[PDB]
Symmetry: C2
Subunit: 180 residues, 2 copies
């Protein structure tokens, strides 16, 4: 781009970031995130997606997917895209800015060490994961050197963590990606 770092997004993902969605139940939020996984694989991306929602309402704020290969950008993990697009939409770099509602990142899989970092600086107050890190390793993705007790590390910084939500459904999509 020359005068910007610009990561374009495939049509289904631009649509996800510009369509109204309020999904109140945690599993509804995760189900939608898993639909973005499948759309992403069809759009040449990795089998990972994530979306930022208002924690209480379930209003979708932004979504992201793994666009590393087609985007030529190793930082383009789903969590980075979802967090950055939510910040852009809300016009702030910090999702816990006074007066903003609490934000939650709903992710198809436990975060790698980069995304662990990004979650901490983002301002989100909640993280909900579907596939576990052993599930992601089992299809050839590396979580990298996260610290021991990364979940506790998040909790100590005010981010409550849920894991294993619709895990089996997320794993079916991981195993599919791997098989092809």
């Amino acid at each position: 781009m020359n005068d910007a770092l610009h990561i374009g997004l495939p049509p289904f993902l631009v649509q996800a970031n510009n369509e109204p969605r309020v999904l109140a139940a945690p599993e509804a939020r995760m189900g939608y995130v898993l639909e973005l996984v499948r759309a992403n694989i069809a759009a040449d991306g990795g089998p990972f997606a994530a979306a930022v929602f208002e924690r209480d309402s379930g209003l979708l704020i932004a979504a992201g997917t793994n666009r590393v290969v087609p985007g030529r950008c190793s930082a383009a993990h789903a969590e980075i895209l979802a967090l950055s697009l939510a910040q852009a939409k809300l016009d702030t770099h910090d999702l816990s800015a006074d007066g903003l509602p609490a934000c939650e990142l709903v992710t198809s899989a436990e975060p790698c060490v980069m995304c662990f970092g990004a979650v901490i600086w983002s301002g989100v107050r909640s993280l909900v994961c579907a596939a576990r890190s052993d599930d992601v390793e089992a299809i050839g993705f590396d979580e990298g050197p996260r610290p021991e007790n990364w979940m506790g590390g998040l909790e100590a910084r005010g981010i409550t963590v849920t894991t294993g939500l619709l895990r089996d459904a997320a794993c079916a999509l991981l195993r599919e990606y791997n098989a092809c």
Copy 2:
């Protein structure tokens, strides 16, 4: 864009990325990354800069700076920008892809935990830092929860780590940023 991840580059950073530049010595590369720190603080960004070089020729591939506040993006650390812009120019996610020259990330401070992870994924083979984690913490920033022995973890993944290079000057700049970052107007800022 709500249609894309888009972090615009200030003009001095477009300039840095446009102009061919070869810096052979570690100190030369770092001296230049420290010019960008000072330019970035003047262009409303954080006191941090980084650049990707060809390790064995010193050719500059891309530079980045902290644009967290001006770019409304908490992901927009120097290292993230430099890595990603380098990737974009060379048209690969992997700086270690076949046929590419080995790359080195030269950075004004030790990476926070996010950037540490970015460095592992990026395909650079060397990381060279100026200010230490304690330096940046001393002006109130926080590197976050890096794993124990993060430097050894890099070397275990084949990424050579050097720290402390022009640390005194990089520390001078952090203090200068610190001294200017308050709300009470002060003319000499």
